[PDB]
Amino acid sequence: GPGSMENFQKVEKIGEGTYGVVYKARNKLTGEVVALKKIRLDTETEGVPSTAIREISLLKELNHPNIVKLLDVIHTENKLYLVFEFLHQDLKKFMDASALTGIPLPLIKSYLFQLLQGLAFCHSHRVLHRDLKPQNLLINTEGAIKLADFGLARAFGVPVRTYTHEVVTLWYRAPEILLGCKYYSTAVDIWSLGCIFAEMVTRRALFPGDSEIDQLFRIFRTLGTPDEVVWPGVTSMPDYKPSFPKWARQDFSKVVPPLDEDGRSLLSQMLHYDPNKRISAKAALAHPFFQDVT
Amino acid sequence: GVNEVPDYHEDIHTYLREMEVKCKPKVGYMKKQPDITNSMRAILVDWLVEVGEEYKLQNETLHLAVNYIDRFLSSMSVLRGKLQLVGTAAMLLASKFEEIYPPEVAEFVYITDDTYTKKQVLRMEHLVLKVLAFDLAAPTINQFLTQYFLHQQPANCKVESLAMFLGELSLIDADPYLKYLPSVIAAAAFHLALYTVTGQSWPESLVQKTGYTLETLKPCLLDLHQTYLRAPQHAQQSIREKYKNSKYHGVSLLNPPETLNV
Ligand SMILES: CS(=O)(=O)c1ccc(Br)cc1
Numbered sequence: 132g133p134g135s136m137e138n139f140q141k142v143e144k145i146g147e148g149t150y151g152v153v154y155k156a157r158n159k160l161t162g163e164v165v166a167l168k169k170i171r172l173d174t175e176t177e178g179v180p181s182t183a184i185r186e187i188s189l190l191k192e193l194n195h196p197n198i199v200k201l202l203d204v205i206h207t208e209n210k211l212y213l214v215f216e217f218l219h220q221d222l223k224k225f226m227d228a229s230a231l232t233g234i235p236l237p238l239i240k241s242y243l244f245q246l247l248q249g250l251a252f253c254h255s256h257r258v259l260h261r262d263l264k265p266q267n268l269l270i271n272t273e274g275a276i277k278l279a280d281f282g283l284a285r286a287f288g289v290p291v292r293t294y295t296h297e298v299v300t301l302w303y304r305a306p307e308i309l310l311g312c313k314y315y316s317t318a319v320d321i322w323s324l325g326c327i328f329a330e331m332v333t334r335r336a337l338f339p340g341d342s343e344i345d346q347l348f349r350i351f352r353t354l355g356t357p358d359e360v361v362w363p364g365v366t367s368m369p370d371y372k373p374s375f376p377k378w379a380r381q382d383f384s385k386v387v388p389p390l391d392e393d394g395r396s397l398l399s400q401m402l403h404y405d406p407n408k409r410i411s412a413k414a415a416l417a418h419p420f421f422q423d424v425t
Numbered sequence: 426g427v428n429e430v431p432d433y434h435e436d437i438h439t440y441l442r443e444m445e446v447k448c449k450p451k452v453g454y455m456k457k458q459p460d461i462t463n464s465m466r467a468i469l470v471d472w473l474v475e476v477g478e479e480y481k482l483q484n485e486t487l488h489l490a491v492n493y494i495d496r497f498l499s500s501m502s503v504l505r506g507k508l509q510l511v512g513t514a515a516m517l518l519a520s521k522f523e524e525i526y527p528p529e530v531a532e533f534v535y536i537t538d539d540t541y542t543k544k545q546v547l548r549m550e551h552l553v554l555k556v557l558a559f560d561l562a563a564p565t566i567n568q569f570l571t572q573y574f575l576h577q578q579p580a581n582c583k584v585e586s587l588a589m590f591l592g593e594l595s596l597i598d599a600d601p602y603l604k605y606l607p608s609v610i611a612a613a614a615f616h617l618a619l620y621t622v623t624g625q626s627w628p629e630s631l632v633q634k635t636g637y638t639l640e641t642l643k644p645c646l647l648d649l650h651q652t653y654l655r656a657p658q659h660a661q662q663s664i665r666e667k668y669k670n671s672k673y674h675g676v677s678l679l680n681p682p683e684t685l686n687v
């Protein structure tokens with residue numbers, strides 16, 4: 132990698148993770164503002180963390196305008212520094228601090244269209260993200276939004292095999308994960324994006340559960356308790372229980388009232404129970420909801 | 426359905442085809458290695474098959490590790506005393522990339538019978554990472570096989586397991602297999618497995634997908650065919666032992682066909 136720390140001037144802390152801290156920094160030679168993610172290997176008895184091996188290996192190949200760019204990796208014997216393109220904010224802080232009276236539909240459609248672009252590009256390169264949530268979506272001053280934080284990401288085979296079950300922050304986690312399915316696929320990222328879409332319109336989480344069973348129940352009370360008709364195989368799934376309350380599917384205009392017919396349509400297809408019928412990012416880009424996108 | 430990524434398999438296949446060329450080892454690296462030979466590498470890889478079996482690792486992990494190893498030995502010259510260290514760090518990196526539950530570093534130290542230290546394994550991991558520049562998402566034979574399998578009419582587990590087996594055998598022998606891309610060995614393996622079990626041949630649908638024909642596959646097939654006939658005689662036997670297991674339908678016990686009529 133063509134970098135060294137001598138050339139960066141740290142500016143402030145901007146975040147912190149399980150393997151290190153992130154600083155906003157400035158390249159003293161080019162002027163470029165970056166985000167430096169430090170991963171301490173000296174405090175590690177197990178060598179380079181797997182999260183970091185996956186983040187670097189996969190982001191090095193994922194070059195897309197709607198995916199945060201890994202600019203460089205500085206690999207000392209005690210510290211590993213990931214140099215990232217810097218974006219001034221995440222979608223969550225934006226929803227809270229400034230989207231108080233709401234996010235205008237133009238910007239929501241623009242954001243969602245860009246998120247789908249980024250995610251389609253991931254899926255086209257056999258990468259699941261597996262942690263899409265507003266905190267992990269970076270926005271700049273120019274109106275770009277970008278997938279970020281690829282530490283829970285995974286390179287998949289076709290067809291997929293069984294991967295880690297402990298995946299996706301709970302509120303954003305797909306039913307097929309919640310029901311302990313042996314296999315999950317690209318549909319889990321679409322689910323997350325669905326939850327995010329709804330969240331952008333309401334500025335509140337769609338399914339704010341406090342446990343796996345509570346999360347399922349909130350999903351069921353909103354979309355109805357799935358049966359063999361809406362989702363073949365569901366009642367065979369490892370954590371499906373016949374004792375599950377059977378709630379009725381509520382009309383979708385009730386789930387997100389301010390949403391127009393096109394919005395409702397797209398959202399219903401992102402939140403389809405059956406992962407096989409759930410819309411792909413690639414197909415979603417052509418949905419009528421985006422006909423007027425900037 | 427979605428588990429076979431219907432809206433992405435082609436994009437993925439094309440992208441894997443591009444990546445295998447970039448992740449390709451130098452075909453003639455062993456002649457430039459002063460102290461190691463194809464025979465030593467065969468011993469190493471056979472051992473990694475055993476390690477994979479012992480720790481119940483995914484076959485993909487095995488393939489990734491071999492990729493890491495050959496690519497490393499393509500630019501870094503290594504004394505025979507150190508070859509196993511390279512291989513250990515390779516398996517560790519491939520495990521951390523591919524496994525839900527990788528073995529701990531200590532278990533890797535343990536399987537080398539304290540030839541090497543934890544410190545040595547860890548330092549080699551950094552070195553390998555430096556040499557490969559963290560390019561670890563490498564296309565494998567398996568990645569192509571599992572896609573080719575979607576073209577069976579109908580699916581046949583004996584076909585699938587025998588193809589996996591044959592592809593695994595190719596990992597052992599740098600000559601000749603270093604000169605074929607994963608996608609091509611996978612093709613040869615798939616055709617040979619299919620022919621062996623059902624008498625059927627490389628499907629036209631896979632001609633459409635891959636642009637490969639029995640014509641373009643012939644060189645690898647003739648090599649793979651020989652490798653399969655000679656497999657009971659090979660110095661290295663861990664793959665055959667592994668593929669006796671019911672997990673893999675005992676496919677190593679099937680008889681190779683004597684001719685391909687190709
Ligand atoms: C240090 S390295 O060669 O592994 C590397 C990896 C990723 C980037 Br982006 C730059 C350099």
Ligand SMILES: CS(=O)(=O)c1ccc(Br)cc1
Pocket residue numbers: 145146153166168199215216217218219269279280281
């Ligand atoms: C490590 S990451 O990809 O989440 C990230 C976080 C914040 C910024 Br600003 C850039 C990159």
Ligand SMILES: CS(=O)(=O)c1ccc(Br)cc1
Pocket residue numbers: 464465466468469472505506508509
């Ligand atoms: C041929 S050798 O003696 O160098 C060797 C290579 C790999 C292992 Br594992 C053991 C021994």
